[PDB]
Design a protein around this ligand. Structure first.
Ligand SMILES: [Mg+2]
Ligand SMILES: [Zn+2]
Ligand SMILES: [Zn+2]
Ligand SMILES: [Zn+2]
Ligand SMILES: [Zn+2]
Ligand SMILES: [Zn+2]
Lengths: 426, 56, 109, 134, 94, 532, 43, 100, 56, 65, 321, 43
């Protein structure tokens, strides 16, 4: 039947007219109403307009099927948001594809398929599709539904239909929610190769054997042969590093080679071992770690301090983390183990203010007896802003008397240090 | 000015001021001096920008 | 800011030649195909799209995958767009017109 | 007093000559970003709060607004506002860094939509100095 | 404060090149960028922690030089690259 | 200005668009009030609005028939719709209002905004200006015709003399509105109805003794001799700007309507008497010829006689008109949808608030040519500063440029603009402050003046017979040549006596020029006047 | 803890409470000066 | 809400369908023993204002040549009831399935 | 020339012509943030290894 | 020299030539080949010739010559 | 083949042979590709670094996040929105091409893509509409970002903001030397010089560190050899820090410290000159009476700028040049 | 030398029948194909 519907010049003649985008539907409705009114009013003399339509994907334009351009110009004259001058003739060969329905981007829904709801952004599984192809049943994660919590909280709205079927606020099965949604709402040996896809993505190596589409390559990172599909390899033309990992409650290691799921780490004992991502309990924050040790000379050493070994190669490097009995030091002059080595602290050498926030009065100065508010203390000196003067002055705290938030008695710097920090009684 | 009849080319009607600041200025002389000052200010405002652009 | 082993020396000349599409593809590590600048829940940047982690670090506390650096010490990277249909350059529109007028419309001579 | 400059008597300056009062008003609102979510005027307690400016929150009372007669300088918070986030992020209005003075008045009312609104006027006494222009 | 063009040319007249360099590279935004010796493009992958230098555009391993320039310079270079204009920074005269 | 606006202009705007295919009888304004959410409406005072940052506006009630709250109009302080106006010193103190405060501003979101007077070129007046030698044109006479009652629109009609001195082509062409191609005045006169060439010359030139004007116009009539029929002239006028139409079919009527409305809309809007347009065009051509011959001095734009200072009154009237038109369109669309009330009041209130907030004086925020700066935050550094700001005037000319002539204050500023008070810098010469004894005309109905002139002995312009009337003084009211009078002295004396006695509003300005023998009467608002 | 602009009467209201004066409909609800000691100098 | 028929593509408000149903397919729906709502869908793409279905090539392309002038949908999502399909051997879904 | 009023047009022209810049101008060095060949920066300062020994 | 035509209903297919020396306006279409001639004046324009041609066509169609 | 008279109207040019038609972009690209080395070499296009085909952009580089900072009031900049719109247009065009190409809407989509690309590279196009951002402001393009005063060329390269500097009013002072300029104590404390620790002045630097940032004759930071900066006010153990050779301390400017003084209208060369700092207990700069003439100073609220050198080279150059 | 010359030529202009002053300097610096007040002197 469609073979006989091919458009022809003498049968099909559609002109495209530019219009303000987005107003396609409203403009089409208005034009149709105007055509009906003209037909009802004029009578026998009717404008030769066969159809007026538009395409959603083609915004800013409408299409009118008329035998002559003048008819379209007269019909569209005086219609706002339509540029009659900006019009073009649609060639016959282009007419079919213009009316061809657009291929919906939604893939054919199948039972068990995974989709995204347009629970916005939550993965869903297609369980059943209605016979009318208008609604689809989707299984989603509500966290999994907990019957115990529902019973404890809102037992009034909770019902049990089966051993694994619960209804809450009008259907949960196996801890997942089933809900109905509208469809519209849903190589040669020795060649250098690199993994672009797969579990070993990012790995690089040298091919050794190829057979039945499977390429085996020796990888420098692992120093072992790995066989991967050819399509997943690309021929290349020839936790992060230094992070601290708590292997166990008493084991701390430093990473020397940070991979995707495989990490090479040197432990406090200096042994270097390869482990998986799951073997790491958590990452220790060096900046937030308040750990300090004592060197041979007795000078305190903290994270980041540069130290030099007294014995051995006298390696110089910055301390990354401090262990109870060992210290990890990274050196830029050493390439072995990424420049990270574990050394004993004894074998290396390095290269709460009560006044704050309380009103005070000065005793021995040029501003004695003047109320002031303490801002900060730099050590042995307290910075105070005067109430009557827009200036901050540094004065020794010992010669200042503290007062209560609201009046109260004056106390020197001998009770707060001795007695528990508390404002006096008004 | 409206205080002068048509075809009055006398100095007092042509912007001339015959009184120093010490004695004072008549309203016509004051208006003429104000016009001169406005002209000077506008000239300075335009010329400073022109000179800056030329220097650039 | 950070120790670098590259030799230090000031620039002495700067060529201003055009940037070839082939060079764009070669240097463009990542690809942009998702108009959305952020993924679902507005937590992670869209993969292979605008503000992709490969190009740079959208926010602090996250290190760019390409360079393992955050806001600082991260120059940035560019992405290549297919652009199947060629587009005239506004700056070179006059140059394009002059070249077309200077060469044959069929033999390109 | 060269170049049209002037010399002013220090004794007169400190005795009540050309002294000035400067009033600066800061306004704060609990504009709602999303229904059922609104700002709260309360003194931050550092619990479940990520953003905390250098402004001293001790001056803030239980209501979260400094009463008249409270010394404020630098970045001291004048109005204590926290916006819940879904626990909350501090949104206080710190005092102007380059200006300081004594808070003069504080008033609380309701906006056209009924949201809580606060207006704090701070008064400062400025005395003539060498750099001041007359 | 802003270091205006008039002040810039006045200092140029004074001949204090060192002062201008310090003002526009030390007292202002300062950045260090890596450029290859063949392609001369800032798009160079340089892992300082791993000390690994490689540029995807050109098949080179160790041809990278570091240059100290203001952040505005690299921003302008990137903007020009967006316009298909590539400032090829070279450390030698041809 | 604000009082007269709220009293008359609001009602006039309502009545102009009252008809719809529905009808609005009257508009009522109540005292300021605040409609707080989850509360009861109550009287609102300026102090309360400032403290609570509320909008000091009064609701508008309009009756609709086959009252509806259409929005809130901001109320200026010390107006006739504010409590403080009907309050004594003790009452003002009880309301926490300073007696010295002069009001004259709008309280929007607590902020006090004052609208600066905007200077514009006076309409309904012909201004003749020379052209630069490179341009072929020699002299151009332009008139900015616009309705003085309602439906205001700009009609800039320009007539240009092509050819410089010695060009041997002394032709005059008038740029009819919506007609890009300039047409000779002869064709326009033929279309109007003055077909005979002698009649056209008599209308153009009053005194036949002056042969220089006839000699200069000879090329004009020579080139216009081709047209001799009204229909041909209308067709030729309609030739340009074709929109897929038939000149002989429903286009002659279109051209006739354009000539009736577009050509000199201010003088009239009816086809009963179209000779007034011909007489006005003849007067314009006579002025242009006099300027070209150098017997008449070139017009100056700086003169305040040709300039009008629109205050908050006209600006608020335009903003209203626009918002009311938008609301009428919206309600019409709603009625069309309801094939088988619901007035969005916010459309007007929010629009006015935006206009008085950011200063963008435009129909909508989307427009980038709103000419920001109309509304400015009132300066209260000192009382004198506030007084100066309240009485400040602004010029629409851009603050940029290096043309000193407009910046300089003309001699006409005597007694109207302070010679000394003016900002220093880019704004110098553009922002002006009026003198102490300076007032802006609020406008009045000219119809009583026209009726009095007609009854007193002013001959109709239709009966004007210049050839048999060598001496006659033209009477102009709001730039309309109503007619001529034979005894100008007696009429002028009677008008002055009536104005002094108080029968006629003193704001009207009457000027008699013996040299030109012309009488001009001005009643439009925005005119600066002083007492003497 | 609070006073009325017109009534000038103490309210001592707490959180989650109306900010409108109980005696009158005015709701300026000014606050009294802090009880903390304050000192000023003539300098 | 506006729904487009899955058989003829006519677009109308749900109230019209509930009151009068489809003006062009009421008889077919009654014969099939199904309600109008089940034979109409709310999801549609594109709007076509047909004025002369008999003399319009677009109507022939959309198989609405015999239908009356009005609003129609180029593409309508969903499937008609099996009874309707059985009564229409030459039925062609408007969802684009048979437009390969 | 880019630093002048014409900013992007000159860049487009250079890109079309692939112009080469020797960076001997003041603007080039200023943009690059390097000591321009101006006065102090015109020359360079080196070290004499033979005079150092005798000066020590 | 580009204007619409009525016989072939083709836009910009009409060209008008004005010989002021002979005062003749000739309108010709490049598609249907229709040619028309009229009297013109020094102030004539192609729009005038088009209007005259349209009026002549209307008169011929009406049969009121 | 004859050469048509190519016109320049809109984004897409039109050529006339006469019949006017829009020249296909693909045809122009093919013609550019067919150009031999000698042709465009003579035209002026360097083959090594340029080609006529390269002018027709077939790929638009995506600026990295630094080129498009996020406001995060996230609050992506207008350039990001323009890039997203361009990507959406390209995706729609690709879908239309893969879902049947009517060739009518294809032209409209291509024109829209060209307009979006042109606006992104140049928002302001003469004789063409300007793209409007979602908000009430025109979309900002790279060409607009490089236009003049506000442009990076003249806004961030020719003239850029300075860290170490101060600006304030100037007052006359007959009791100051010609080359000596008064400096407020507060400005002196805020402004600092990174003096390197040396044995010659080790004791003085240690005393300054002990004084602390609050005391004017002191310092606020002590840069270690590793380069990390430690704040003195935040650290309560400032007095326990022992200075070592090779370190740098940000010491407050002292007397006889050269610093440049300038006024914003630097009309002539002598508008920016070095002066010796003299700390005074007032909030106004003080300079010699004579130096007003070269600066054109008037003391009527005139504000001037002081720049403190931050290196030995800069200090020597300012003192000598 | 160039910058010193530019400053020395610009400073007098800022300090400051036949056109003279800033307009004359601007005309001289520009090509000035058209002369506002052209003049010629013959001895
Ligand atoms: Mg001064
Ligand atoms: Zn990165
Ligand atoms: Zn060829
Ligand atoms: Zn490279
Ligand atoms: Zn009360
Ligand atoms: Zn034809």
């Amino acid at each position: 039947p469609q073979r006989f519907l091919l458009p022809s010049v003498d049968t099909a003649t559609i002109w495209g007219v530019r219009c303000r985008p987005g107003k396609e539907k409203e403009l089409i409705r208005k034009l149709l109403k105007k055509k009906f009114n003209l037909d009802r009013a004029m009578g026998k003399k009717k404008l030769k307009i066969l159809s007026i339509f538009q395409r959603d994907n083609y915004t800013g334009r409408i299409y009118i099927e008329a035998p002559k351009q003048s008819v379209i110009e007269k019909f569209c004259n005086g219609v706002p948001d339509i540029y009659i001058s900006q019009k073009l003739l649609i060639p016959v060969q282009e007419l079919p594809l213009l009316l061809k329905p657009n291929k919906s981007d939604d893939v054919a829904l199948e039972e068990g398929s995974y989709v995204r709801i347009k629970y916005k952004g939550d993965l869903a599984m297609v369980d059943q599709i209605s016979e009318n192809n208008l609604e689809v049943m989707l299984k989603i994660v509500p966290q999994l539904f907990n019957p115990t919590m529902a019973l404890r909280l809102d037992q009034a709205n909770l019902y049990k239909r089966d051993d694994r079927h619960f209804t809450y606020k009008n259907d949960y099965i196996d801890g997942y929610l089933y809900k109905s949604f509208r469809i519209q709402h849903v190589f040669e040996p020795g060649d250098h190769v690199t993994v672009i896809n797969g579990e070993h993505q990012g790995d690089a190596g040298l091919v050794l054997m190829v057979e039945q589409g499977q390429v085996t390559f020796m990888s420098t990172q692992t120093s072992r042969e790995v066989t991967i599909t050819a399509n997943n390899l690309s021929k290349s033309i020839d936790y992060a590093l230094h992070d601290i990992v708590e292997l166990s409650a008493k084991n701390v290691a430093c990473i020397i080679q940070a991979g995707h799921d495989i990490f090479k780490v040197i432990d406090e004992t200096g042994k270097v071992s390869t482990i998986t991502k799951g073997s790491i309990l958590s990452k220790i924050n060096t900046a937030r770690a308040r750990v300090s040790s004592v060197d041979a000379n007795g000078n305190e050493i903290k994270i980041g301090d540069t130290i030099v070994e007294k014995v051995g190669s006298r390696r110089e490097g910055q301390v990354l983390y401090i262990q109870t009995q060992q210290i990890f030091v990274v050196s830029k002059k050493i390439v072995e183990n990424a420049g990270v080595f574990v050394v004993n602290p004894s074998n290396v050498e390095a290269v709460r203010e009560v006044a704050l926030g309380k009103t005070v009065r000065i005793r021995s100065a040029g501003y004695k007896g003047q109320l002031g508010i303490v801002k900060d203390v730099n050590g042995d000196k307290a910075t105070v802003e005067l109430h009557s003067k827009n200036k901050h002055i540094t004065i020794d705290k010992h010669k200042l008397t503290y007062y209560n938030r609201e009046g109260g008695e004056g106390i020197t710097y001998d009770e707060l240090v001795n007695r528990r920090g508390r404002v006096p009684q008004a | 000015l409206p205080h002068f009849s048509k075809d009055d080319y006398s100095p007092e009607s042509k912007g001339f001021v015959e009184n120093s600041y010490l004695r004072g200025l008549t309203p016509q002389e004051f208006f003429f001096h104000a016009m001169g000052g406005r002209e000077g200010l506008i000239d300075t405002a335009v010329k400073t920008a022109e000179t800056g652009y030329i220097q650039r | 800011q950070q120790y670098s082993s590259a030799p230090l020396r000031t620039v002495k000349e700067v060529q201003f030649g055009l940037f070839s599409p082939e060079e764009v593809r070669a240097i463009s590590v990542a690809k942009i195909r998702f108009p959305e600048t952020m993924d679902e829940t507005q937590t992670r940047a869209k993969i292979g799209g605008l503000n992709d982690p490969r190009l740079g670090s959208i926010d602090r506390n996250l290190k760019c995958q390409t360079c393992q650096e955050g806001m600082n010490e991260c120059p940035g990277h560019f992405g290549h767009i297919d652009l199947a249909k060629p587009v005239f350059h506004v700056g070179f529109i006059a140059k394009i017109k002059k070249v077309c007028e200077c060469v044959c419309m069929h033999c390109g001579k | 007093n060269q170049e049209d400059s002037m010399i002013m008597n220090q004794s007169s300056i400190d005795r009540g000559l050309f002294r000035s009062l400067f009033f600066r008003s800061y306004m704060d609102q609990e504009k709602k970003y999303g229904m059922s979510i609104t700002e709260t005027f309360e003194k931050p307690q550092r619990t479940n709060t990520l953003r905390m400016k250098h402004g001293t929150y001790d001056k803030l009372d239980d209501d979260g607004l400094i009463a008249p007669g409270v010394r404020v300088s630098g970045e001291d918070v004048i109005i204590g506002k926290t916006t819940p986030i879904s626990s909350k992020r501090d949104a206080s209005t710190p005092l102007r860094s380059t200006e300081n003075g004594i808070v003069d008045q504080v008033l609380v009312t309701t906006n056209q939509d009924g949201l809580k609104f606060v207006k704090v006027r701070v008064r400062t006494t400025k005395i003539p100095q060498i750099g001041d222009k007359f | 404060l802003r270091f205006g063009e008039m002040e810039r040319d006045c200092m140029i007249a004074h001949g204090a090149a060192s002062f201008l360099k310090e003002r526009l590279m030390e007292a202002s935004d300062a950045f260090r960028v890596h450029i290859c010796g063949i392609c001369g493009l800032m798009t160079v992958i340089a892992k300082l922690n791993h000390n690994q230098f490689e540029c995807k555009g050109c098949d080179n391993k160790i041809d990278i030089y570091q240059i100290h320039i203001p952040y505005a310079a690299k921003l302008l270079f990137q903007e020009l690259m967006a316009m298909n204009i590539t400032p090829r920074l070279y450390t030698d005269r041809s | 200005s604000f009082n007269q606006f709220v009293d008359y202009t609001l009602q006039d705007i309502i009545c102009e668009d009252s008809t719809l295919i529905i009808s609005f009888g009257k508009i009522y304004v109540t005292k300021p009030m605040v409609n707080e959410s989850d509360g009861v409406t109550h009287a609102l005072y300026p102090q309360e609005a400032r403290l609570r940052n509320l909008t000091y506006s009064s609701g508008l009630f309009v009756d609709v028939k086959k009252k509806v709250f259409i929005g809130r109009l901001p109320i200026m302080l010390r107006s006739k719709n504010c409590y403080l106006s009907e309050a004594t010193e003790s009452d003002l103190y009880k309301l926490k209002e300073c007696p010295f405060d002069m009001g004259g501003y709008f309280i929007i979101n607590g902020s006090e905004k004052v609208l600066i007077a905007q200077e514009r070129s006076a309409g309904n007046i012909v201004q003749v200006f020379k052209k630069a030698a490179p341009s072929p044109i020699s002299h151009v006479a332009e008139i900015r015709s616009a309705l003085e009652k309602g439906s205001r629109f700009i009609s800039t009609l320009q007539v240009k003399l092509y050819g410089r001195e010695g060009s041997s082509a002394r032709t005059i062409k008038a740029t009819l509105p919506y007609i890009k191609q300039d047409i000779p005045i002869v064709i326009i006169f033929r279309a109007l109805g003055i077909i005979p060439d002698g009649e056209i010359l008599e209308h153009i030139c009053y005194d036949v003794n002056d042969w220089q004007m006839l000699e200069m116009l000879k090329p004009c009539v020579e080139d216009g001799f081709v047209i001799q029929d009204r229909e041909t002239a209308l067709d030729f006028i309609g030739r340009r700007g074709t929109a897929l139409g038939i000149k002989k079919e429903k286009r002659i009527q279109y051209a006739k309507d354009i000539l009736q409305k577009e050509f000199l809309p201010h003088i009239t809007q009816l086809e009963g008497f179209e000779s007034r347009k011909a007489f006005f065009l003849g007067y314009m051509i006579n002025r242009l010829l006099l300027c070209a011959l150098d017997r008449k001095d070139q017009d100056d734009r700086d003169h305040f006689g040709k300039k009008r200072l629109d205050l908050a009154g006209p600006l608020l009237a335009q903003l209203f008109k626009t918002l009311f038109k938008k609301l009428t369109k919206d309600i019409f669309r709603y009625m069309q949808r309801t094939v088988e009330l619901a007035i969005n009041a916010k459309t007007i209130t929010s629009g006015l608030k935006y206009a008085l907030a950011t200063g963008n004086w435009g129909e909508q925020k989307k427009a980038m040519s709103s000419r920001a700066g109309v509304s400015q935050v009132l300066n209260r550094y000192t009382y004198s500063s506030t007084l100066s700001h309240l009485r400040r005037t602004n010029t629409p000319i851009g603050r940029d440029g290096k043309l000193a002539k407009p910046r300089q204050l003309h001699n006409t500023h005597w007694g109207l603009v302070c010679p000394a008070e003016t900002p220093e810098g880019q704004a110098c010469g553009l922002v002006k402050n009026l003198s102490l004894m300076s007032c802006i005309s609020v406008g009045t109905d000219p119809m009583p003046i026209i009726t009095f002139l007609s009854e007193w002995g002013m001959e109709p312009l239709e009966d004007y017979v210049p050839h048999q009337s060598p001496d006659a003084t033209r009477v102009f009211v709001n730039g309309v040549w109503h007619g001529v009078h034979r005894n100008p002295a007696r009429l002028m004396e009677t008008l002055r006596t009536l104005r002094r006695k108080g029968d006629i509003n003193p704001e009207v300005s009457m000027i008699r020029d013996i040299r030109e023998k012309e009488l001009k009467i001005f009643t439009d608002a925005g005119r600066v006047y002083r007492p003497l | 803890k609070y006073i009325c602009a017109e009534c000038s009467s103490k309210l001592s209201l707490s959180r989650t409470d109306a900010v409108r004066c109980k005696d009158c409909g005015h709701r300026i609800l000014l606050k009294a000066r802090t009880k903390r000691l304050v000192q000023f100098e003539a300098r | 809400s506006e729904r487009a028929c899955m058989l003829c593509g006519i677009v109308q408000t749900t109230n019209e369908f509930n009151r009068d149903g489809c003006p062009n397919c009421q008889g077919i729906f009654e014969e099939a023993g199904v309600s109008t709502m089940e034979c109409t869908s709310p999801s549609f793409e594109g709007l076509v204002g047909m004025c002369k279905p008999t003399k319009s090539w677009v109507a022939k392309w959309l198989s609405v040549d015999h239908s009356i002038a009005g609003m129609y949908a180029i593409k309508v999502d969903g499937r008609l009831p099996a009874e309707v399909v059985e009564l229409l051997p030459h039925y062609k879904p408007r969802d684009g399935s048979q437009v390969e | 020339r880019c630093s002048f009023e014409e900013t992007v047009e000159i860049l487009f022209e250079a890109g079309a012509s692939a112009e080469l810049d020797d960076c001997r101008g003041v603007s080039e060095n200023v943009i690059l943030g390097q000591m321009a060949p101006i006065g102090t920066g015109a020359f360079d300062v080196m070290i004499d290894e033979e005079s150092l020994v005798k000066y020590m | 020299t580009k204007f619409n035509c009525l016989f072939c209903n083709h836009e910009k297919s009409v060209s008008c030539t004005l010989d002021k020396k002979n005062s003749i306006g000739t309108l010709s279409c490049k598609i249907c080949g229709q040619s028309f001639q009229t009297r013109i004046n020094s102030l004539s324009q192609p729009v005038d010739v088009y209007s005259d041609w349209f009026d002549a066509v209307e008169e011929v169609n009406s049969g009121r010559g | 083949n004859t050469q048509p008279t190519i016109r320049k109207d809109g984004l897409k040019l039109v050529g006339s042979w006469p019949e006017l038609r829009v020249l296909s972009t693909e045809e122009i690209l093919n013609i550019f590709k067919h150009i031999s080395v000698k042709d465009f070499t003579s035209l002026g296009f360097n083959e090594v670094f340029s080609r006529p085909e390269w002018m027709i952009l077939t790929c638009l580089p995506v600026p990295p996040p630094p080129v498009r900072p996020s406001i995060s009031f996230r609050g992506e900049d207008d350039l990001t929105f323009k890039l997203a719109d361009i990507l959406k247009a390209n995706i729609s065009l690709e879908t239309l091409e893969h879902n049947g190409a009517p060739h009518h809407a294809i032209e409209e989509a291509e024109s829209l893509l060209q307009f979006h690309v042109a606006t992104y590279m140049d928002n302001d196009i003469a004789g063409q509409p300007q793209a409007l951002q979602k908000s009430g402001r025109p979309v900002k393009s790279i060409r607009a970002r490089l236009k003049g005063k506000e442009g990076r060329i003249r806004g961030n390269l020719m003239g850029k903001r300075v860290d170490f500097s101060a600006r304030t009013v100037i007052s006359g002072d007959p009791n100051l030397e010609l080359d000596q300029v008064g400096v407020p104590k507060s400005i002196a404390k805020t402004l600092t010089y990174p003096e390197v620790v040396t044995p010659y002045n080790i004791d003085r630097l240690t005393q300054l560190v002990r004084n602390g940032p609050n005391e004017h004759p002191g310092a606020k930071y002590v840069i270690r050899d590793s380069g990390d900066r430690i704040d003195l006010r935040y650290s309560k153990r400032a007095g326990d820090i022992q200075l070592q050779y090779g370190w740098k301390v940000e010491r407050h400017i002292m007397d006889n410290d050269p610093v440049l003084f300038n006024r914003q209208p630097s009309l002539h060369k002598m508008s920016m000159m070095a002066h010796r700092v003299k700390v005074i207990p007032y909030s106004t700069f003080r300079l010699n009476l004579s130096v007003t003439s070269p600066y054109n100073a008037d003391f009527d609220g005139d504000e001037m700028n002081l720049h403190v050198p931050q290196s030995e080279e800069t200090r020597a150059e300012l003192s000598q040049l | 030398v160039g910058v010193l010359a530019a400053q020395s030529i610009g400073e007098p202009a800022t300090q400051m029948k036949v056109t003279s002053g800033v307009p004359r300097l601007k005309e001289i610096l520009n090509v000035a194909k058209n002369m506002k007040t052209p003049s010629l002197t013959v001895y």
